[PDB]
Amino acid sequence: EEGTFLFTSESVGEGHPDKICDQISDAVLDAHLQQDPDAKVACETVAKTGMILLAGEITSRAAVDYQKVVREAVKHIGYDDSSKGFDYKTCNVLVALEQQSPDIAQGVHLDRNEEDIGAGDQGLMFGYATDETEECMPLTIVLAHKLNAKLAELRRNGTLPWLRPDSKTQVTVQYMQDRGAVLPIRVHTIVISVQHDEEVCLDEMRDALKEKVIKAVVPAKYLDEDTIYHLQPSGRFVIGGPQGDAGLTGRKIIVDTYGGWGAHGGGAFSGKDYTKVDRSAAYAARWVAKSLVKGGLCRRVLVQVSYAIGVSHPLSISIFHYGTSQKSERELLEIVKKNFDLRPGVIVRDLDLKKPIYQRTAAYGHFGRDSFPWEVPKKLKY
Amino acid sequence: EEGTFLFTSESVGEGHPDKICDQISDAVLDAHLQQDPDAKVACETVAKTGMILLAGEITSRAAVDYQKVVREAVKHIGYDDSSKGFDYKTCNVLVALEQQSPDIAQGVHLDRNEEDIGAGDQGLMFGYATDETEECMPLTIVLAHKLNAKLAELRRNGTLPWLRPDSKTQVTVQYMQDRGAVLPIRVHTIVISVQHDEEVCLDEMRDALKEKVIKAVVPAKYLDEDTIYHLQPSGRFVIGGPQGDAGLTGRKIIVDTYGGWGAHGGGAFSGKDYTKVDRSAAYAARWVAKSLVKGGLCRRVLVQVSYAIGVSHPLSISIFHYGTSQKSERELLEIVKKNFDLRPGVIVRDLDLKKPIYQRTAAYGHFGRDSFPWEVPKKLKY
């Protein structure tokens, strides 16, 4: 219908190989932060059949047992037997970690007052918020994440014991335009692909995915006779995890954020401490966007920020309200200037970014969940 | 001023460690395609001090010497001596490549007519085009790429022999809003960081970056007394390449596309054959967007498509013209339906995607350059 459009977002499960890497990178970050709140961490993870490799740079006073940290993260995910394609007990864990470059350290944080630390890199970052859900996230991505979480729940509780940890989901919603804001109308298409054991047949899987997964997550009001279902569309997914597809940290950046809505500056979150603005400034930009929506200044908003390595203040700040505010971009920028300080050395304090809660962010999206500091709106003064 | 806003984009050089990985992944893809046009390639690359690791899945009739292909790509980039932090002659090249999963193969392409091959994965992809430049790309990202290309040119011609291959640039432009389209007004901020030798001083570098790099790339009409320059803002960048920062394939997806403009579905391009719609459908979506702008139907346009693994036709198609077309989204969608076939097995034919030209795409952006097939607009019938 006129004034409507489709939008699609995807999500992946905890055992998707890229997501395994994000979770391991953040388990390593958390392990360091538990002993050294000021650890400098830049931990990439790579996963392929039988292998977890850590590559990157860490300067920290912590004593971390990488073998134990990696294996415990893989155990949590559920890869605990060679029949599943990967086993935390018996996989190879390889470590290629060096200190942070002294050239970066001297230009970013050495001999600097914490509030005045430089950005750990240049880059651009965006924050986004939409009033279409209470949590201020797009419905497409929320539903896609919840479908993966449901698969993991039914795997872990033994309801569907043929499930394995690697999964992907995709949701297409038809939206109505509403003066710049968007209103979900119906779910147009759902995709679910999930790794499974050798014994279960396709019909049993398709029936369970519709009845026990989709119906348990997606409100019936969004589903109708025209909704298209692609359930196990490849027909067979026994080989999975890193054995089926090499994974890397920071290869699910759109799943981690807004499912394609808003915008993205390209930076990966996992495996990085607060001085890496790819993460901290994106979290702060989400916090600003959500504060503008919860504060009633707009219904839908996009915030861009950018930095130069070694420089504390952002180089640029931009706000686009999609036509959903009575205030101009200039007025919203002035409100943001009066209420937020987007230097990394201040974001760390406001968002408590030395706390070891990062592994919890590394599956099911970094935003719209669990009342993390960047999800608690700031009361705005103007 | 009212009706203006800032936008920032970045780019990186050929020796940035993530970009090294993209180029090696695509050198491996091209090597396979030279012998087997139907090679199934999913080659991830990881780079850290002294190491190139290939991890992924390849099923191909080609006989490829990975040691030679990798080392030749690194030689081209310019890492040819231990003084530069990396040397193609003496680095470690490790290979963890297996066949493509037979479960993926059977669900995607085995026993399928080429035109009717399934998408190689689920996912979402976007195309974007803007009339602000002749090549239909945002000025921010074009300038950022050209600044890196200029550094490589002056390194290779011996003008600035202290330059090394690893670089990053960032450009902020102030734009005027123009009925949904955008008009560049001025360059607000430029960042340049580039790896250098131990002998050159900061003042010599800053002067050269302004006079021989910025002035040689950015038209003087965009630069004024208020333009901010952050040139070598870290103060020292001797350690660089993989030694300074671990690189991975598909960690520069925003640099590869539109510099943050438009939208991105999350997929990486490099190291993948045409059946991986993360690449082929994004190229086709750019081709559609550019065709709509060059055809005079809009000034600025965003196209979303999405797929399910094993299914040939896209699940969804959406078009947003930013208010720059007299035609509705419905009319533009009908034009696209009548003029394009976005099945991967048809995109391969239209865009000649079995040709080994991929290494050429893997630095300086995949779009707006060199009249690749996706940059040559299709004449539209309606």
Ligand SMILES: Cn1cc2cc(-c3cc4n[nH]c(C5CC5)c4n(-c4ccc(OC(F)F)cc4)c3=O)ccc2n1
């Ligand atoms: C008066 N009015 C007019 C409106 C128009 C739209 C709207 C329509 C639309 N059709 N196709 C898309 C995109 C291609 C899929 C649309 N997008 C859209 C644009 C950017 C987005 O984020 C990121 F992708 F850049 C997300 C969605 C809209 O925003 C929404 C609300 C409105 N109100």
Ligand SMILES: Cn1cc2cc(-c3cc4n[nH]c(C5CC5)c4n(-c4ccc(OC(F)F)cc4)c3=O)ccc2n1
């Ligand atoms: C009548 N009219 C009104 C217009 C408004 C804008 C426009 C203003 C603007 N302010 N801040 C931004 C973004 C935060 C940086 C703006 N964006 C924008 C939105 C999305 C973009 O892509 C991707 F990031 F999603 C890129 C730019 C505009 O498009 C442009 C043209 C117009 N014409």
Ligand SMILES: C[S@@+](CC[C@H](N)C(=O)[O-])C[C@H]1O[C@@H](n2cnc3c(N)ncnc32)[C@H](O)[C@@H]1O
């Ligand atoms: C399809 S694979 C990417 C392509 C792959 N590298 C190849 O060699 O063709 C991407 C993701 O899809 C999922 N996947 C793996 N095997 C699958 C299968 N048989 N059916 C459906 N999805 C699968 C996993 O989540 C995997 O990480």
Ligand SMILES: C[S@@+](CC[C@H](N)C(=O)[O-])C[C@H]1O[C@@H](n2cnc3c(N)ncnc32)[C@H](O)[C@@H]1O
């Ligand atoms: C700043 S590093 C990312 C952070 C890093 N992993 C760490 O341990 O802090 C990202 C990119 O910046 C560039 N870079 C490396 N060393 C730099 C330096 N001393 N000054 C400026 N940029 C640098 C390289 O292009 C590198 O790939």
